[PDB]
Structure formats: C-alpha cells, structure tokens
C-alpha cells in the first residue's frame, strides 16, 4: 500500500509539549542543578540527548529517583538547554555563553555545540588566546579550524 | 553589539584522576556482576568528564580494556569451560547476553570517550571494544571455539537426519555475525566453512546413496531435500548463508551425477512415452538451476527424436507415413507446451531434429503434397491440420520437390477437381504464400477463366 | 540577540522517541482497548491529540490510573494511530479502514481524518451509497464535497 | 489494487440518548461543585460522542446551556451577592476562576461538540458559551455589576489619594477584557468609561486646584502626576487603557488652562531671564505632547523678544548698541541650544523677530558696518565673533550696509585694520558687486605696493 507521512506533525507535537510544560501539568522528573529546582518531562528529556538517554533509560540507580542532581552546569545553562529541547529555539546572548558551551559539552548535544560555535564565531582579535585555550580543552575540531582560519585572515 | 566577552576563567589543573579512576573501576566491577541498581550514573559520567578535561582518557582506556579483559579471563572463560559438556551453547549465549547488556551500560556511562577520544584518536568504540574482546577471549579460545563449532555442526546434522533445539543455534549464529563488527569474518571462519564442508560431505554421501535406481522418486525427494535445506537455513541460520548452501546443494546433489540420472532403464527422460506432464515437468524445473544442466536434457531429447525419426521415416503407405510424421510432431510439441515452459533451446533442438530426418528422405515433399490430395478428396478442423501441415513446410529445405510435385498434383486435383472445396484451394495458397503461387495459380485460375 | 532555530531537531526527537518505544523502556500508561493491552508513553500520548490531552492532563479520574479502558476503537486502529503519533507515518490498507476512520474521529486528529479521506478518495461507482451514509454520519465536509464532485464526474 | 471494499456494516440508531444525558448532566453538575477526582473522562466523552453522532447536538447544547446557567443562578449569583459588601472583588474573582476551570474541564470532556457541531452550525464554542453566560449572568446583573463599578472606582481613587491592592483590580480588570470575547466591549462599557469619567472629574478639580500660583513646582508635580498615572495604569489597569488616560491627562491637566500657566508674574516663560536650562526645558518637554501646545510658548517668547528688541534697537554709543544686539542674540540662542532641542518652529520664530526689529532701525546697517571697523582697530576669537556678526548680516533686509564701502576707505587709506590677511577673509565671509566694489579699492592698495 501507500503509507502517508506528515511533516507538520513533528512540530505540532513539539508545540503541544511546550503548551503542556507551560500549563505545568504531568511533570515527572525534577533536577537540582545548584540548589535550584527545575522540573521537566522524563521521556521528553530521555530522547533529546544520549546523556539523558543513559540517565532516564540506562538502568542505573538514577531511574527510581524523583529528584536528580545535575552539577558541573549552571542554572541559566540548564534552563537554556531545556528550552532548546522543548522548542528547538536557542536564545544565545553574551551572558549565556561559556556556561552554555560547557553544559553543551557535558550533555553532548551536537546542535548546541554548533550553535555555540557560531555565536563565538560572530564575537571572536583581542581575546583569541583564551578562546583557543577553551577550544583545545573541550576539543572541538570545528572551532579549532575556524580559529586557525581567522588567525590566517588576520 | 559592542560588548567585550572576557569571561573565560577556566582551569582543570587538578591531579586526582587516580581517585576518580579507582571509583570508576569499582563501578565497572559492579556493573560486570549486575549490581546496577545502586550506582549514580550522573556522578559516574562526571568522573568520566573530569578525565577527559585532565586528558587522562588513555588511563581510562587502558584501564577499561584491562578491566573488561580481566572479567573475561575470570568469571566468563572458566564459567563456560566448567559447562563445556554440560548445557553448553546456552551458557555461551547467556554469558554473551550478559556481556552485551554490561557493555551497553558501560558505553552509556562512559559515553564521553565515544565522542571525543574514540572519534578524534582513530580507535575502536567502547561497544566495539567489548565485542572485540569477547571475540578474542571467549570465542577463538582454542577449546571454546572447537566445542562451539562441533555442537553447532552435530546439532545441524541431527536436525538434518531427529529433532534438536533451534532457538540456541539461531542465537549463536546471530552472535557470530555481530561479532564480525560490520562484516561476517567470524561467521565465515567459525561456522560457515565447517558447516559448508560437512554439508558437502553429507550430500556427496547422499548422492552416492540416492543413485535408488529411480528418477521420479529421486527427483521429487531431491526437491524435498533442497526445500528442507532452504527452509532450515532461513529459519535457524543467517540469511547470507542461504546463497552458498543452495549452490553447494545443486553442485553436489544433482549436478555431480546429472548425466547418469537423466537416463536409467528402469525409471524420466528415457521413458518420456508415458507423456505425464508432471513427470517431465518436475525434472526440468529441478534441472533448470544448474548451469549447463539444460544441455544434457537437450542432448537426450535430441537423441530420442533422431531415433524416432529414423525409425518412422525410413520406408510404406503414402498417407499413414505422413500421419505418423504429424502425430509424432503433435506429441512432441505437447511436451513443450505443457511439460516445459516453451524453452527456446528445447524448441530449437526439436526444430533442428525435425529439419534433419524430414529432409533426409527425398520422397517427403511428394508425401507432403499428397497429404493435401488425400485431404482434398468439419471444415474448421481441416484448417487446423493446414496449420500443422504448414509447420513441416517451413522445415523442409527441399521445398522445390514439394512445389514441383504440388504443381504436378495441382493438375490431378484440378482437372477432375479432386478437391472437395474450391474456395479453400485458394486458402492453401494463401497459407503457402509469387512463382511459388502463380505457377500453382496459373492452372487453377485458368479453370476459373473458362467457367464463364 | 539572535536566536538559532533548528528544524532537524523535531524529527530527531521523534526518531529517538520511536527508538525508546522499540527498546520498551520508560513506559507509563497502558491502554486496554478490547481486552488487549497496548503500552504507551503518557506525555507523548498527551500532546498528540486534544482527546488524549483531556484524558491524561485534563484532571479527571483517569489521571491516577495505570491501566485505562478506551472504547470506540479497534485494536488494529489503536495500534495504527499510536504508530502515527510515534513516527508520523500512517500505513493505510483496505483492512485498516472504517476502523481507522472511526478511531481518527474518536481522537479527533485532523491529520488522520485527512489521510482516511484521501484513501477513500483513491478507492471510492459501486459502493457510493454506504460511503455517503458513513460520511453523513461522521460529518466530514471534505469527504462530502469530494463525493459530490465524484458524482458530478460520473 | 483490484479489491472490493464492501466493509461498512454500520448501524447506531437508538433513542437511549436521554438516559445517557442524565448521566452527562450529573457529571457536569459534579464538575460544577469541583468533584472531578472521580469521573471517568473517556466514558463522559463517549456519552458526548454518541450524543453527537445520533444528530442530537441541539439537545446537548440546550442542556449544557441550561445546566451552566442554573449553576450560575444558584451558588454563583447569591454566592457573590451575599458577599456584596464583605470581601467583594475577592469572592467574585474566586467564582470567576472556579467557573473558568470548570468550563475548561467541560470543554475538555465535551470536546466533540466543539469540533463538528459548533463548527458546522455557526454557534459559539463551549468555552465562549461559558464566558458569555458569565458575562450575562453574574456580571451585568444590575447589582453585582454596579457594586463592581463602585469598588473598582473607589479603589483606584483611594490609590490616587492611600494604598490599595492593585493586584485585585488587575484580576477584575483582565477578567473584564477576557469577558469581551475577542474585543473589549465589556471593558469599555463597564469599567473603562466610568474610570476615565472619574479621572476627568478628579483631574479638573485638581486643575482648578493647582493654579498654587507657581510654575516650576507646578510643572514638576504635573510631570510626577502623569508619570504616576501611566505607571499606575500599566501596573493595575490593562494595556489598552494607557493611551486614552494619557490623552485625558494631557487634555485636562495642562491643556485646559495652558494659556494661563505660561505667564504668571510670581513665577517659566515670563521670567526666562533666569536662564536655567532645566527651568525652561521641563516646560518645553511637558507641553510638547499637547497639539497646538508649542504655539502658546512660541507667542509668549516672541512677545518678550519683541519688547526686548524694541528697547535694544531704540538708540546711544555705536559700539555698545551692536554689543547689545550680539549678546542678546547669544543669550537667546543659548536657550535653543541647551534648554530646548532646537525646535524648527522655535528657531523660525526667533529668526522672525530678529528680522523684525534689526531692520526696524535705519542706522542699524551703519552700526553693523561700524562694528567691523571698531573691531579692526586672540585672532581665533576674532573669527568666532565674525560668525556671530554674520548671523545678523543675513537677517538684514537693508544690506544695500554702501557704508561698508563708505567705511572701506576709512579702514584702508590709513589702514585702521589690524590684520590685512583677515580683511580678505571677511569678504569671503561676506561672499561679485557685493565684493568687487569692496575689493576694487582695497586691491588697488595691493597694486601700488609693488
């Protein structure tokens, strides 16, 4: 037979999940980042990234726990990444970088890595030493070769 | 935007990986023994993140290889050795399943290594590392591999002969494939080759045994055997095996001694006079797969047709002779219409033989012209015999004799009008169809001219 | 600032959700259709359709219930609509129609209604009376005007 | 595909709709009293699903309207009426919130009606039906509405006076908006019109009050008032009310008696001789919003400049006269550079006055021509006042200033000019016949110097 595939359904489901979160009903997992509680959907926060997949569905002790501990990340960064997962839109400003980049390296989401790399691309010849240090630490090939190209353009 | 960034005070100069390692190694030990209900995944991944920043991933790497190979040396190897003859294969698959779930968890909690070390240093993934270490430690032991191979070979033989387990052999087959990473080298060198060779030996024994001096039973039961083999392979073994086995079957069960089974005095090609559609159809459809196989059946058919033509053409009553020609032709084309699938090569060889003996006699054309004379002495049926009669005409290379005699008979069938129907006398020309026609028409149309 | 929006994220999230369902982990709601149990994610099955939104997140008694009895749907139809929700692909054949049509009306999902209308568009001058009766019963304007156009073409 | 379909064996006709309507009505009544923890959602929807499928949509709609209006007559109307003077605007907000959540649940369990009956019968949705029945039944009562109007009006009035709970009024104010469906008709006819009316009356009492006979204090406190009003409206009222209230403020507080606050003998435009940038800047920036407002200050300052100009022109020492011209010009352009924002109309009208009296003097060009000669009798400062001296030059309509040539002899023959090189520059500042006749005599002294 001929199967019918709809493209708008995925984004419709995403908006529906956003509306559900805004209504604040059917929340199941609560994360403590730095003493600040942020509530989220467990299954939604299980298919977004591999880290959360190995967290909410890995099979470790973390499953049967309502409150979980998310350290090494900043509350603003966690709110930003949850917002991205829930509506595929990342609001990147000057303040919410170098804490969003380390959080993105934590959770290993390629989309946030690429978005942060673009943001540092836009605002990159006065502070290239520390940016190069950060890129070498977190080991992003794209950031490194773009920085090399920028040095060449200099 | 005209704002400075200047917000990167980051440093990971803390040498305490030994502590984060010992803890991670205890975690791996606990996962190996299936105590995952009480380990903090987030903290375990944190231990993993720190080593990445500290660039001590190599210590975690060497340590991970060491811990997995240590757990494989102890509590897996002799775990299946102690069950080598007792409930074997099941223990191997169980151990394999436990190892698979353990390595899935280890990759889950150490997943950073799979994203910046494994990718950026051209080394095997954690999952692939577990698969490889299983392939190098548990299987290909030299005793586990030998026993595993024998158990699969013996079981698939008893199934070939008895009833044995089918789930386990399927699990092991799948394990052998997935142990070859993308490929199937483990399958090829572990179970494929011994199974293929033992099947070759078994089928050669069956080939020497089956020849028992019968053809229909032999060919039908060979069809049953090959169907059983393909059904078994699709059920238990893996799909890529289904190609080479069937070929080996048709290499050893029929094509090994194909020439001696086409002809045997007691039982299908030799006595095709039975005329059974199934009897020859099954034999054709079962020799169709073997390359060059069609040639031997064509040769046997050709020999029989040559002998029949020699026997029947060699003179004899003028009309029963051609009746024999046409009835043999009808019987032989019956086979190609209902026994075979109108194979081009078979049609070609029948045509060639018919062109051989029919023209071998010089009186044939005379008899073919007489046929009509006897014929002219329902009307739709007569038209049908014209089509069959026109078939031989195309075969004759000496149609000159036929038309010359047909013109000689044309006078005899015209002057006193031996022909029953005049209108058909033009139709046979239309089938026969200028000089082939006008000389046959000049005499007749003259009788039309003088009739006014 | 500039916000970065990713389009592949929604499809990736649906694919990950399908993978999680196939792994059969982190299931929360179980539906008894006609004595047959079908297991599904509650929040995933809470933003797909308004019916399920009112069921799981409405606030009625159905919330605090692991097993939920759902009627007015056939097990094949329930499985088909769950498959659509999980991967946005609807496999429509002869058997799964007039059972999927009512199921689509039960959940009031416009996409499935449109897909069933298209399937009836393709296979429609021998059984027009019963199709017209069905369309009038379930009150689909699009199906009715398509049937009128088909009668005109006749 | 060549397969027959023939798979529609459907039949549903039955008259059991009333028996299940009894159950659905009991369920709706239970939801009205907030007992939703024990009602099977799917069964309630199924009842509605069948109700709609058997074409009994009208019966269900009439029953729903009847049950919602019956719950509004009893347990809402006197529920807030019995609290009309006790904790009002809090009990009504609670009733509105309970009704809103109840209607959300009812729309949730009766959602089929909102998809195929409401849409295909050109009627109002269940949510809008609840909103309309609330708007018609509990508010616009004639007693509840009237008391609501008093409570909101008195509260905002006390706030202008005392401290009130803006948040409470925000709830009622917003409820009033959302009760108008898409629009704000209920807001316009229930709170917007009385509020604006009270504000008008209060502000007219205030306007007759503050005129106390001061300008700087008055204008600063008026600025504080409008800033309070706009913040007050944004904080407690809705966001579509800020524009009309701001216009009423600027119409009734300052534009009612703008002509009388621009000049008063005790206090800004009248006595602008103080020269304070803030003193006139506040008045400008606070009369800028009113249409025609700038005209009154334009005329007031124009009259002052005319009176100053007449006395200034009235002649008198030749040098001090032009000194008065220049420094009055400097003082008045100071206002436009630092007190105002260099308004085009303001600059135009000062230019007009300057064009009026500067040529009201026949000897003015003679004095203007003398200036240079007296000046010619730091060098950068000399260039600066030349730019200022040029400003009056353009204003004169009687340049035919012949006297520059009459003087040209007396600053050349004995060379009263201090610097010869600049003596050419002033021609360039002045810039053929306007220049050559000024150059023919001078350049001749350059000719005979070889």
Numbering used by the authors:
A (entry chain L), C (entry chain K): 24 to 147, 149 to 178
B (entry chain D): 14 to 174, 176 to 225, 227 to 282, 284 to 331, 336 to 397, 404 to 459, 464 to 482
D (entry chain C): 14 to 174, 176 to 225, 227 to 282, 284 to 331, 336 to 397, 404 to 426, 428, 430 to 459, ...
Which passages does the manuscript contain on this structure?
Among these, Cullin-RING E3 ubiquitin ligases (CRLs) stand out as multi-subunit complexes comprising the Cullin scaffold subunit, an adapter subunit, a substrate receptor subunit, as well as an E2-recruiting subunit RBX1/22,3. The ubiquitin ligase function of CRL3s is activated through dimerization. In contrast, the BTB-containing Kelch-like protein 22 (KLHL22) plays important roles in mitosis, T-cell activity and amino acid sensing. CRL3KLHL22 ubiquitylates several cellular substrates, including serine/threonine-protein kinase PLK1, programmed cell death protein 1 (PD1), and DEP domain-containing protein 5 (DEPDC5).
We then determined the cryo-EM structure of CRL3KLHL22 at an overall resolution of 3.8 Å. The overall shape of CRL3KLHL22 dimer resembles the letter ‘Z’ when projected from the top. Two CUL3-RBX1-KLHL22 protomers present in a symmetric unit forming a homodimeric assembly with an overall dimension of 220 × 120 × 120 Å. To further investigate how dimeric CRL3KLHL22 is assembled, we generated a mask for local refinement of the N-terminal dimer assembly region, and the resolution was optimized to 3.3 Å. We found that the CUL3 NA motif, together with the CUL3 CR1 domain, tightly wraps the KLHL22. The CR1 domain interacts with the BTB domain of KLHL22 over a wide area mainly through polar interactions. A well-defined hydrophobic core formed between Leu52, Phe54, Leu57, Ile122 of CUL3 and Leu83 of KLHL22 also plays a role in CUL3-RBX1 recruitment. The hydrophobic residues of the CUL3 NA motif, such as Met23, Phe21, Ile18, and Met16, project onto a hydrophobic surface of KLHL22 formed by Leu161, Phe162, Leu158, and Val155. Although the density corresponding to aa 14–24 is clear enough, the density corresponding to aa 1–13 of CUL3 is blurry, which suggests greater dynamics of CUL3 aa 1–13. Furthermore, our structure of dimeric CRL3KLHL22 reveals that the dynamics of dimeric assembly leads CRL3KLHL22 to a transition between a compact conformation and a relaxed conformation, which gives CRL3KLHL22 a variable ubiquitination zone.
